[PDB]
Amino acid sequence: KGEELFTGVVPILVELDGDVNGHKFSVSGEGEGDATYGKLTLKFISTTGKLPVPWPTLVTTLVQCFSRYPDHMKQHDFFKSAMPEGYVQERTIFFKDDGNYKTRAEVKFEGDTLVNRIELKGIDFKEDGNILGHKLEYNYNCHNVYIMADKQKNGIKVNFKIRHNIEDGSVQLADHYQQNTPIGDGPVLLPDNHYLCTQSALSKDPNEKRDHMVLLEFVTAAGITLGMDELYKR
Ligand SMILES: [Ca+2]
CA-angle at 45, arms to 132 and 32, nearest 5°? 125
CA of 134 to the centre of ligand 1 (A): 6
Of 147, 149, 145, the residue nearest 174 (C-alpha):
145
CA of 164 to the centre of ligand 1 (A): 14
CA of 146 to the centre of ligand 1 (A): 31
CATH (domain of 22): 2.40.155.10
CA of 138 to the centre of ligand 1 (A): 9
CA of 137 to the centre of ligand 1 (A): 9
Structural domain including 31 reads: 2-231
Spatial distance between the Cα atoms of 192 and 147, rounded to a whole number of angstroms = 8
Spatial distance between the Cα atoms of 204 and 13, rounded to a whole number of angstroms = 19
Q: In this structure, are residues 162 and 60 in contact, taking their beta carbons and an 8 Å threshold?
A: yes
Q: In this structure, are residues 217 and 200 in contact, taking their beta carbons and an 8 Å threshold?
A: yes
CA of 40 to the centre of ligand 1 (A): 24
Render 189-228 in DSSP notation, one character per residue: PPPPSEEEEEEEEEE--TT--SSEEEEEEEEEEE-SPPPH
- 57 three-state secondary structure: helix
CA of 124 to the centre of ligand 1 (A): 21
CA of 133 to the centre of ligand 1 (A): 9
Q: How many domains does the chain have?
A: 1
- Partnered with residue 115 across adjacent β-strands are 13, 108
- Residue 125 backbone phi and psi in degrees, to 5: -80, 145
Q: In this structure, are residues 43 and 56 in contact, taking their beta carbons and an 8 Å threshold?
A: no
Q: In this structure, are residues 136 and 57 in contact, taking their beta carbons and an 8 Å threshold?
A: yes
Kindly provide the resolution of this structure in angstroms, with one decimal: 1.8
CA of 47 to the centre of ligand 1 (A): 16
